Design a protein around this nucleic acid. Structure first.
Ligand SMILES: Nc1ncnc2c1ncn2[C@H]1C[C@H](O)[C@@H](COP(=O)(O)OP(=O)(O)OP(=O)(O)O)O1
Ligand SMILES: [Mg+2]
Ligand SMILES: [Mg+2]
Length: 511
DNA sequence: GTCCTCCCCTC
DNA sequence: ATGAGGGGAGGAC
């Protein structure tokens, strides 16, 4: 019915449910990604400004580039020597490090390969990186996000997704302060819907009324992606999104004011679109993608089907082959080739997979799910839930090895001693920060030989308290690296090119 | 039944 | 041939 909203009371009320809000076409999701994260951490640590051309350096490689340094054309994975040729007043700052034979990390500021002084080097042969300064700042940011929002997913060290559904719903129905104009409050613009909601006499399966003309005074905060100049507020999804944009700016301002960090952000009805949108404009910006602008956005020329999370690897390339996708404008191609329903794409996939001479990363028993995923992704309507993650899931300590710096079992164990110190300190920090007992249950050793062959072993680790944790980790590590040395007998083995220890499973006890 | 090994995904 | 981490399949146990 064109006399009513596209959306229902069910879809609106669902915003108030953390378990179901993501399923709604009215969902308001944010993806927030810290700008030049490791470079901003170093900037803040060293009392420097947004205008200072800071780069974070790991060995000889630039792993994060401040937006000031980007103005000189410096890019991630430039070597420090390449970057110094682009910017005469560059401020390179090496990551903190552990020294082999020691059990703590520190910064050696004023030290690095770019420094002439032979006494101020950080040798790759006898140090490993500590990323703990970045992890600590990430956890501080997470605490701020969780204070602001009831459902926050930490997606990686500098990314979160927020479900703004409760905040948006509550603002829509209950906020009696918010002003649209100097003459018009939100409460008065939304008098009809609030009357219905408080009155309680709606049917959940009824469509909402068409939006009131007065709510069109509501502003979006940020950059609304809108190359076709579509009307900004035309249905309740736009109302929810605009309210979300206002809230989202407030949350990002809290991060900036408290921690000093700028962020980029994407706002839309789905996690996948949010993640694309947060990368669209940087630094210090939020890009908003209206439902009516989803195809405009997806088809802007920046994106392909391989841009979507899970599809950037071998499954994505397989789908390009199987579905006969073009090298460009693949998203539109998917949309237009199976234009009516996901069943059209399912039929096509089923025929391809049923062929006797097929194989693959496609599950032949789950083609319905794959078809629906692709159909919806190509329209910007594939809604995945947010997961609130545990305090920790895994912890890894890794050293890729050069030359002969791991040339025997003695060297392996020397590196394991650093790994065990590092992991134990990380566990202790988490226990204190979160008031938990954090208990490693399973450990994995993974290593690569001189010929790049991978050897791995995993198994249980015993628990005897935090004061014996490093010892219990090392016991198992020693057992595993000696076991693997035997397995490598009479084969290309030493000197190793990689050694790592990962705690892959933890028990977390609440206190 | 769960564990171990290999593998794919992302920044 | 360049340190994290999330996650699942399936044969081993
Ligand atoms: N391939 C990588 N290897 C090691 N560290 C990485 C890699 N990619 C990114 N990082 C680290 C450094 C980054 O500051 C941090 C967050 O990554 P990411 O958000 O992609 O870049 P960024 O925060 O430096 O820039 P942007 O402003 O584009 O977000 O993770
Ligand atoms: Mg970032
Ligand atoms: Mg990232």
């Amino acid at each position: 019915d064109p006399h009513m909203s596209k959306f229902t009371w069910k879809e609106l009320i669902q915003l108030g449910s953390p378990s179901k809000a993501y399923e709604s076409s009215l969902a308001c999701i944010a993806h927030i990604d810290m700008n030049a994260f490791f470079a901003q951490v170093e900037q803040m640590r060293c009392g420097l400004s947004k205008e200072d051309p800071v780069v974070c350096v790991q060995w000889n490689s630039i792993i994060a580039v401040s937006y000031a340094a980007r103005k000189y054309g410096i890019s991630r994975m430039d070597t420090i020597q390449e970057a110094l040729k682009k910017c005469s007043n560059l401020i390179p700052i090496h990551t903190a490090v552990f020294k082999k034979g020691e059990d703590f990390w520190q910064y050696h500021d004023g030290c690095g390969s770019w420094v002439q002084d032979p006494a101020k080097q950080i040798s790759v042969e006898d140090h490993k990186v500590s990323l703990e300064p970045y992890r600590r700042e990430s956890r501080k940011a997470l605490a701020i996000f969780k204070w602001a929002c009831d459902l926050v997913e930490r997606a990686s060290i500098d990314e979160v997704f927020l479900d703004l559904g409760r905040i948006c719903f509550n603002m829509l129905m209950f906020d009696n302060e918010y002003e649209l104009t100097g003459d018009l409050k939100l409460k008065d613009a939304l008098s009809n819907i609030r009357e219905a909601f408080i009155g309680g006499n709606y049917d959940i399966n009824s469509h909402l009324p068409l939006i009131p003309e007065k709510i069109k005074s509501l502003k979006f905060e940020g950059d609304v992606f809108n190359p076709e100049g579509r009307d900004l507020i035309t249905d309740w999804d736009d109302v929810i999104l605009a309210l979300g944009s206002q809230v989202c700016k407030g949350i990002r301002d809290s991060i900036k004011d408290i921690l000093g960090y700028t962020t980029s952000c994407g706002l839309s009805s789905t996690k996948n679109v949010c993640k694309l949108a947060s990368n669209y404009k940087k630094p210090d910006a939020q890009t908003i993608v209206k439902n009516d602008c989803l195809l405009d956005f997806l088809d802007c020329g920046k994106f392909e089907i391989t841009s979507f999370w899970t599809l950037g690897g071998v499954l994505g390339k397989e789908l390009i082959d199987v579905l006969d996708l073009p090298h460009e404008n693949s998203i539109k191609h998917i949309r237009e080739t199976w234009p009516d329903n996901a069943g059209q794409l399912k039929e096509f996939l089923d025929a391809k997979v049923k062929q006797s001479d097929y194989d693959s990363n496609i599950d032949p028993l789950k083609t319905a799910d794959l078809a629906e995923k692709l159909f919806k992704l190509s329209r910007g309507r594939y809604g995945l839930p947010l997961s609130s993650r545990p305090v920790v899931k895994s912890m890894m300590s890794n050293k890729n090895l050069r030359g002969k710096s791991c040339n025997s079992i003695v060297d392996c164990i020397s590196w394991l001693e650093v790994f065990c110190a590092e992991l134990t300190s990380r566990i202790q920090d988490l226990e204190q920060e979160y008031n938990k007992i954090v208990i490693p249950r399973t450990v994995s050793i993974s290593l690569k030989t001189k010929s790049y062959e991978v050897y791995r072993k995993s198994g249980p680790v015993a628990y005897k308290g935090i004061n014996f944790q490093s010892h219990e980790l090392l016991k198992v590590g020693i057992k595993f690296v000696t076991d693997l040395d035997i397995k490598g007998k009479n084969k290309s083995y030493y000197p190793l090119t990689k050694l790592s220890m990962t705690i892959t499973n933890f028990d977390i006890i609440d206190l």
